[PDB]
Amino acid sequence: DATPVDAQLLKFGMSTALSGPAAELGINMRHGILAAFDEAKAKNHLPSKTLKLIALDDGYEPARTAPNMHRLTDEHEVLAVVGNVGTPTAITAIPIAQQTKTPFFGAFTGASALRKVEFVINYRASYAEETAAMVDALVAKGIKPEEIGFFTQNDSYGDDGFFGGLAAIRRHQSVKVSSLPHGRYRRNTSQVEDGLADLLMHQPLPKAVIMVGTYEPCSKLIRMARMNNFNPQFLAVSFVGADALQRSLGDLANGIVATQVVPHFDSDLPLVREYRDAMRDYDPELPLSFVSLEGYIVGRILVKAVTSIKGEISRSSIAAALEQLGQFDIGLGAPLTLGPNDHQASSKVWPVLIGADSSQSLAWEELLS
Numbered sequence: 001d002a003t004p005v006d007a008q009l010l011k012f013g014m015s016t017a018l019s020g021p022a023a024e025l026g027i028n029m030r031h032g033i034l035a036a037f038d039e040a041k042a043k044n045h046l047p048s049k050t051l052k053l054i055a056l057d058d059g060y061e062p063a064r065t066a067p068n069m070h071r072l073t074d075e076h077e078v079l080a081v082v083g084n085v086g087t088p089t090a091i092t093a094i095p096i097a098q099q100t101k102t103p104f105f106g107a108f109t110g111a112s113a114l115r116k117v118e119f120v121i122n123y124r125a126s127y128a129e130e131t132a133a134m135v136d137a138l139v140a141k142g143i144k145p146e147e148i149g150f151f152t153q154n155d156s157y158g159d160d161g162f163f164g165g166l167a168a169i170r171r172h173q174s175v176k177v178s179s180l181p182h183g184r185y186r187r188n189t190s191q192v193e194d195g196l197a198d199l200l201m202h203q204p205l206p207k208a209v210i211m212v213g214t215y216e217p218c219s220k221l222i223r224m225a226r227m228n229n230f231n232p233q234f235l236a237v238s239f240v241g242a243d244a245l246q247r248s249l250g251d252l253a254n255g256i257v258a259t260q261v262v263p264h265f266d267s268d269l270p271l272v273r274e275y276r277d278a279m280r281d282y283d284p285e286l287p288l289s290f291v292s293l294e295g296y297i298v299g300r301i302l303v304k305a306v307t308s309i310k311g312e313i314s315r316s317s318i319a320a321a322l323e324q325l326g327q328f329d330i331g332l333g334a335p336l337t338l339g340p341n342d343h344q345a346s347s348k349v350w351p352v353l354i355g356a357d358s359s360q361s362l363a364w365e366e367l368l369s
Helices: 023-041 062-072 087-099 125-141 156-172 193-200 215-227 244-253 271-282 290-308 315-324
Strands: 008-016 050-058 148-153 180-186 207-213 233-236 258-262 326-328 336-338 352-353 359-360
Touching: 008 023, 008 062, 008 087, 008 193, 023 050, 023 148, 023 271, 023 290, 062 271, 087 156, 087 244, 125 156, 125 207, 125 233, 125 258, 125 352, 148 156, 148 193, 148 215, 180 193, 180 215, 180 352, 193 215, 207 315, 215 244, 215 258, 244 258, 244 290, 244 359, 290 315, 326 359
Parallel strands: 008 050, 148 180, 148 207, 207 233, 233 258
Antiparallel strands: 258 352, 326 336, 352 359
């Protein structure tokens, strides 16, 4: 009761899926951020500052995102909202961040809606970029544009990935949007039967299915496809959660390709080695994942920006500091770029091939080999 406290508390907020069928996404984003914050404390990166994350559960449901965001920006007075999972959730969250002038940084979503939003600053490559990489690689291997199908969540997330795929296909062949194979499922359900039937009845039958969904419904779709005598090349976007997908499917995940917005967590890139050390010290029982690696990267960039601030640390000075990063290197093997007119740090897409027991980096020229 008598001890001076001169450390300034720096509060950051997050609204994310900490429960429900997509919980692995929010849980692991949160762990990655917290591992970064743990490391920053351990190494005295922010002397006389205390980092705190206020993480509220929205279950990947926009109806819960809205009141969470009001609480984070009003009563909690957070300095930035960091790492929130999802597209329909972000679409609800962003106007609240904008009206309160709160930086909305490193959201776990590649949606174009975040990439047109002055307060929205992104680390990761977009769904347009992931789907372009997939489509170009498929076509290079002799898959016809008309043979590429989509299995997507029936909302703004699935729409965004589908539209990215459509644009990528259109670069190779003019098509009407109604011609593409496109099965859908409702967010946070396992109701994938109708979507599978739509793919199966398509002319021609898809040879590749791009999955713009989450791990639970995607796992069920893959199991059901194989039961229904259908074995195309499945490709999962980053948001699916490749680690959770592999855990659910086991051997049935062997051969799936999944695009990531981070390098492999087994890489010896300096940042990745630092991620592994931070995770080990933070909680050695947690498995590594692409999701927590992304959260760690977001935390690292945030801390780097905060370190640069001279004077009051505030919403406005954090927004400015993120833009002041310019071209910078955090040990990813290639530079990141942020600025007043550049709000996406990375366009890099790292494909991985899921095997029997693990995943490994994939060169696109080895796709379907």
